[PDB]
Amino acid sequence: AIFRYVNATLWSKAGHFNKALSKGAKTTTWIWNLHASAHDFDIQQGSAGLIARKVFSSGLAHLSLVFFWLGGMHFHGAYLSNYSAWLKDPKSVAPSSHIAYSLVGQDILNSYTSQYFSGITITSGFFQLYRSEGIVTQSQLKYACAASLIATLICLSGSYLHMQLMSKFTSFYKKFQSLSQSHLIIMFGFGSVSFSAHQIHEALPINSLLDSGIWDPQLFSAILLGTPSAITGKLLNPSTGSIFLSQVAAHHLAVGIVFITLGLIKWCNLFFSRNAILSLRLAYMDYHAQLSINLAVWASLSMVAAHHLTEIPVYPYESTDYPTVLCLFVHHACLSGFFTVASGAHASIFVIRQLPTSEIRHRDPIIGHLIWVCIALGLHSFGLYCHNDTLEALGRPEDTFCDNSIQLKPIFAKQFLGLQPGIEVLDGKIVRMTQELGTADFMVHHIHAFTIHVTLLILLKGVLYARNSRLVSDKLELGFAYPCDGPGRGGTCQISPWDHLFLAVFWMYNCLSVVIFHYFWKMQSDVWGSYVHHSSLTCSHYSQGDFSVNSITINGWLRNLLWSEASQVIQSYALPSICSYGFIFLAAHFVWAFSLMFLFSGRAYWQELIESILWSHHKLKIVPHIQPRALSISQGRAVGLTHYVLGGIGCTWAFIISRMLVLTT
Amino acid sequence: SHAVKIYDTCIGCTLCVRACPTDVLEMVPATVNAAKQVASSPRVEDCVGCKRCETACPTDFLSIRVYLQENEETQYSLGLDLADWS
Amino acid sequence: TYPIRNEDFLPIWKQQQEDLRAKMKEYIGREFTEIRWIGDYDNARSPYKPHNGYY
Amino acid sequence: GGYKMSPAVPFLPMSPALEGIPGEEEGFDPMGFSLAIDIRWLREAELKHGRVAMLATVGWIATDLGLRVPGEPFQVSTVEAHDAMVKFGSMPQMLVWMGYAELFGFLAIVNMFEGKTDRKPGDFGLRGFYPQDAKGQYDMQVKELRNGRLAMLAYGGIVTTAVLTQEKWPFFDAVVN
Amino acid sequence: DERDEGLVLITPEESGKVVKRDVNNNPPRIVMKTNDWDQPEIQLSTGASNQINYITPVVASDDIKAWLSLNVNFFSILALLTVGGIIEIQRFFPDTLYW
Amino acid sequence: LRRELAIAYEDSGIDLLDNGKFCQGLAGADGAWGRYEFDPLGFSKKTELVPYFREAELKHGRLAMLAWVGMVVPDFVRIPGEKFSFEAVPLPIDGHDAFSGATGVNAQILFWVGILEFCCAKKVFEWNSLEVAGDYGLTKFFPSDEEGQKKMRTAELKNGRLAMLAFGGAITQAVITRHPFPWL
Ligand code: KC2
Ligand SMILES: CC1=C(C#C/C(C)=C/C=C/C(C)=C/C=C/C=C(C)/C=C/C=C(C)/C=C/[C@@]23O[C@]2(C)C[C@@H](O)CC3(C)C)C(C)(C)C[C@H](O)C1
Ligand SMILES: CC1=C(C#C/C(C)=C/C=C/C(C)=C/C=C/C=C(C)/C=C/C=C(C)/C=C/[C@@]23O[C@]2(C)C[C@@H](O)CC3(C)C)C(C)(C)C[C@H](O)C1
Ligand SMILES: CC1=C(C/C=C(\C)CCC[C@H](C)CCC[C@H](C)CCCC(C)C)C(=O)c2ccccc2C1=O
Ligand code: SF4
Ligand code: SF4
Question: Quick check: A471 and B79 CB within 8 A?
Fold first, then answer.
């Protein structure tokens, strides 16, 4: 409440928050520690009330940042986009709300999207989102941008205010029953009901008119009008290739009602098995416990979103916008992986800072059986691929695991939609087609399970052995993020939960790369493509259905997926559309290789090299009084991990997007 | 086992002894420094080689040195728990 | 060869959309006019004299 | 006698920040903005708005009545004059000059807040037709404030009604129903 | 502190014992030490009050100049100006036709 | 008696102790022949919010008193305008839909009401107390006696509650019957 204590005097102190940074700038390690501990509000000077203040205000500031980003997206759609051309004819014109300058010949990046527009094709599905929302006018998009900017300002003001409104007595953030009830009834229930209302009152008429072909201003400014009795999802909009928006609105109304009912039964105490969860309720009333749980929840929801946004079509024309659906799936899968490893990290932090649950007292059997299942899964799943490779090379296809040869049928992969026979098409494209599972799907799914289990093994080992282990018994005293305990006892490198995350991130990236490749190749070979004429169509797929024949071997993956489908990105230099993607492919390769420097080398070599270099500076009287230092061990690991993941993700990003853009245009 | 040696640069601040995880070191009377004590390493057989003494040593270069000897590894220096060589 | 799922509905869907088009055409009473992406239209219920036709 | 009540809103107590300042005779601040923001900043912003709005009102009235400066590029209506002159190049140069003047105004505000100079909120040192007596100075400041407030409201009405009815400044021959 | 001049600031021990009104006619305010560096003291009201409580922060040009003198802002501004200069040179004299 | 708001605001704010009276001794709990302390659900047990409850009650009563008369008068007479004529709008219940949206006729009313409420929120929250609940200084015609002031406050509250129920009755009957005043 007292705002006289907020002054810019501390802005120039640069390290006031951390007491360990009091002896300001004796080395560059001080700068690095400042950055590393900037947002670690728990270990910073102050009190628990201040920690809560910072957490909540930072959440609000990030909310404002996201609102600013959304407002920028809306502004770009309104003023720097071909949304008008896309709306009138989505198929011919690729979405593009992105324009580049003509600085150094950089105008080559802009590619033909419409007669009067040239730019970069966007892959976020924002045009389809606008169409679903009923936004069909520049004025509507402009007012959406204005609302987003106003929300940004409001959130910024809220953060600034709450930095002082909340005092040491503040306890509203500890009212978990009130928090959960409010979020469940208002944020989710009422939110879903209100969005169903919005759909019914605005989007349904506009979308129906757009499907018909009407573009009249008076009409733009009778539910279930066109939807038959067919089950939702069993019949897609013939003119749009997506679930009926009236069905979506009914879904949101039902979901809001269900959430309100759940909240009300919780309010009335109808739920009875409180004791089964009371232990968790007492244990996990912590910042890091809640952060870990929420991160895992949102990771799983992001993965489900990645799957459903493609398998179940709900946005107009997103089904046929192949780059959009692919990019959405890949982006949300990557976010799922990142937030899962985050949940592991903050579980470890909670274990370090608070008392763990009693399942940590038989941790040896848990991790031992997880190790065994990881080993067995990896052996069988990957050795089937290796067996296929070796036997096929020897010239014995009859001995390999494939549909024609020994076949591993996925008996448990059974249908549940009960769809009618055939496929759904929309203007020379396959909006929806059943995925037929065989030996290749069996093998790839078990590879997925293996990688998921190994990542889980790393995270769980880090969590359970955070406090102590047979090797070192004072890991709790060591803390959360330390490089080692020493060269002793054989060597205690990377025994910390921080390093366990540092490895689990590598494994999550490996898992997600395999998942991305599986989705990409399977969709290209067996789902996406065009058709050539009760009528029967012969479907010409982009990859020509080679997944089921070539995916059974690692050589097939290397040749038919990486080498064969890298033709677009590798040969993209002359092409105006994707030359940027080719350059980013090259640069991401460079960055990934550059990460190996930090991942393989060690601190001492660089410190000694720095001292030898500094000899010459001292000789010439160039004396830096912030004495240069080699990056700490943990920082070197972090830098290597960041560059490695960024380079790999960039290579995959450019490769897939170039392929999709060229194929669809 | 490892070799833990102490040099006369020692000032007897006891930080090595306090940082010892398996109590290998102990302060002993001396006249070399003003503190009138120098760390010793009688129980070097228990030294694991963590170099926490070395980390805690203040002197410009360490007055206590732990030389690792991987060829002479014992169960005490390896911190063996599940297996017993005794 | 893959048959097209729900073939029978496509003629029905075309008939429904054409019927709705005719219904709205009759309701308005004039030919549909393409909306302008950058254009500005007066509200049909505005109390001031029209500047640009509200349709 | 209890609190000192606002003459504008008799059922609310006068904000102590707006005592001794010109315009305290009304004492209008029911929302309590003077209890949250510095009255110096509030009055500086009020005077800037009043002066800018007076100039804008007179300019809009003049352009609507006619009186366009010689030249072809200026043969546009007041509503579209903003965009026309932005394309022409007048508005960017005017904005550069505004940035210069506002840099000096910002320096004035900063120095006033830091106390380096005993500068009143809106004072820039201009003394033209300014009465010598203190009562006259107070009356002239109140006159400035009231004319500026009237000009703010008048410009809001003028711009809104012009955009709505597409009529000239008087709007008297406009149709509303 | 000029903000609270003329205010009756009673310690928690004197709450309710002192009822003298302020210069602004407000009731006395209870002052408490919180032991927080960010908010060392907090004030509670004994009743309805009509007083100025600025929500704007106290920022000094000297503090802003020190913050910009921080090496980060200095070198970021230097690098931004350099990058802008190179970009504008590329714009004005493309392809190095002179060379 | 009623003191000037300036003096009354001297002792204002959320009281913590409780005068031991029904609803802190506020007016409006008085039967025709005796005392009628109506609070079956015990809302007045929140003595700190009692002033807020009285302010809200008086606001609702005044608003509904205006609303009932505004549902009665339009059918008998209308503003001399083409869009307010009986042909454009047959019954008052149609006014909301007729004047909602781009027409702005009701938007202006909403805007001015919002401005007034924004200006009165300071009294509603800060300067609310048992004695100044619903008192905006508009005390013209207010009797200069304790008994007269109490009786006038009781009459205001009773008429406000009667109109509070009567507006619900009239609006519901009008929507059900689509008929003139008598059924509203
Ligand atoms: C607990 C049982 C109970 C029930 C079930 C019940 C039901 C109804 C019904 C519906 C069936 C109506 C429509 C109705 C109406 C009124 N009741 Mg009533 N009432 C009950 C109890 C009391 C008491 C104790 C008093 C009272 C009064 C009034 C007044 C007078 C207002 C005035 O003029 O002040 C009016 C209009 C007060 C009074 O003085 O009545 C002469 C009064 O003291 N009621 N009452
Ligand atoms: C909105 C509306 C209407 C209206 C209206 C209304 C009420 C309009 C009001 C307009 C208003 C109130 C306009 C004031 C301008 C004042 C100016 C320009 C003062 C300049 C003053 C200057 C330039 C002074 C300069 C100096 O002081 C300086 C800086 C220092 C010293 O050297 C002294 C001098 C003198 C040199 C209609 C028409 C009624 C109906 C229509 O339908 C809608
Ligand atoms: C017309 C319209 C609109 C509308 C509307 C509006 C404004 C609607 C307003 C509705 C309103 C205001 C409805 C009140 C109901 C009151 C009830 C039910 C009271 C019951 C009371 C009961 C059951 C009992 C009371 C008592 O027992 C108590 C408690 C104690 C006893 O001593 C005395 C008695 C027995 C009496 C839109 C949305 C604006 C536009 C749209 O186009 C259509
Ligand atoms: C290279 C390396 C160093 C030396 C690296 C250092 C000191 C980093 C240098 C930091 C610079 C000064 C930061 C400034 C950023 C770059 C210079 C930006 C270049 C951008 C280009 C596009 C021009 C370590 O210290 C280290 C420590 C532990 C494990 C591995 C390693 C390791 O691999
Ligand atoms: S070995 Fe190091 S820490 Fe131990 S007494 Fe000697 S100088 Fe001190
Ligand atoms: S290396 Fe470790 S165990 Fe060995 S003496 Fe030093 S501190 Fe003790």
Answer: yes
